[PDB]
Design a protein around this ligand. Sequence first.
Ligand SMILES: N[C@@H](CCC(=O)N[C@@H](CS)C(=O)NCC(=O)O)C(=O)O
Ligand SMILES: N[C@@H](CCC(=O)N[C@@H](CS)C(=O)NCC(=O)O)C(=O)O
Lengths: 205, 205
Amino acid sequence: VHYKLTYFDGRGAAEIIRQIFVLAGQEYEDIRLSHDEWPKYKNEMPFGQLPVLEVDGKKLAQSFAIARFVAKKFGFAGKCPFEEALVDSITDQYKDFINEIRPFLRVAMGFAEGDLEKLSNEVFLPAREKFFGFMTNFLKESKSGYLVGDSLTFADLYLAECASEFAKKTPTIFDGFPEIKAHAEKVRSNPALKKWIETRPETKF
Amino acid sequence: VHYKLTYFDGRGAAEIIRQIFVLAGQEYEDIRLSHDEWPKYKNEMPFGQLPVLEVDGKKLAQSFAIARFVAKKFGFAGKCPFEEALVDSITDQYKDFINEIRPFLRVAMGFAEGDLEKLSNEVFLPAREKFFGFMTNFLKESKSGYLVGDSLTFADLYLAECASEFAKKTPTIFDGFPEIKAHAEKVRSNPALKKWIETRPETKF
Ligand SMILES: N[C@@H](CCC(=O)N[C@@H](CS)C(=O)NCC(=O)O)C(=O)O
Ligand SMILES: N[C@@H](CCC(=O)N[C@@H](CS)C(=O)NCC(=O)O)C(=O)O
């Protein structure tokens, strides 16, 4: 079975898919297209966008559909049909949270001008508060330290990566959410992830 | 196994989940909360929102996670692991298309004021053009008349329902997309769906 994953040069929407391959021990081509060459390849993608996974020559788009596909192959999608659905509900909520902080992310990423501190105070931190409060109710219920069931799933991976990364410039992101901080530390102490985080290309996004 | 599905009184984000139960022959409680009672129950929902499915007393949120869960129980999620992922990629694209026409949908639904005809011309129809063009490439490749594989999946259900419903007030919605029109007719000639469409509560959204 050969895997190719195509994205731009950044962590962005592809990074959890890479971490699932990392945890599985599975080799894949990590293809990172430059801005200049993108218009030449856009046409090969099912919805003209990235990331795209190619699985023995067959193309699959949509980062959550790809993460789910790879997680199910390697045992990170949840351990029974109901737990898989809980994992899916959590990643769908995370997608809503990402959509909600769009105005913040567009300025923080240089794609628009605006008042970064104000967007942080008014858009990002209030949105993280609601999202972290729902994630914390899951962690209070699991009592394994993982969001769903007794072991790591790709829902754990989206939450820890986003919490750890936002923590770099938003120092107060864990204030009032000590379970969220413990989960991110627990997930990132996974030895395979920890080494990938040290070794991966160092990019702004 | 007992199923309860809670939504507001409308088709909205719950309707495909209802149609999956319809096709399966599976009975469920179709719970429809009024606007006035909503604040009393919001707290029982995992992310304070609807729809929510309850499966022998266990709650599951997020309309696509629920549709997937029910479709997988009843055989409408795709017939092998790769086809399931294609079905997921198509419903994720549909969610992007829905997010893109938000400005149109907010005015059309009375939740905001604005120029409905202009939003239709500038936001809705250009967005449907890109989305219908990608869906048509799938239908050209399938040659069964379904989006993925040889039989109906819940990806077919989202596309046909949204195309048929928008067609009611947007008369030109099929112009230049004869495959999309044939797919919606094919899906809605399914006898179980056709009877549900006649029998379901008649609501504005
Ligand atoms: N819902 C999609 C979103 C994909 C997406 O936003 N792709 C961007 C990544 S920057 C892209 O390819 N933009 C380039 C373009 O649209 O041409 C997913 O989760 O994969
Ligand atoms: N991504 C969610 C969106 C759910 C959603 O938008 N729910 C609305 C339906 S009108 C809602 O419950 N609004 C009431 C509220 O937020 O209090 C899904 O697909 O289920």
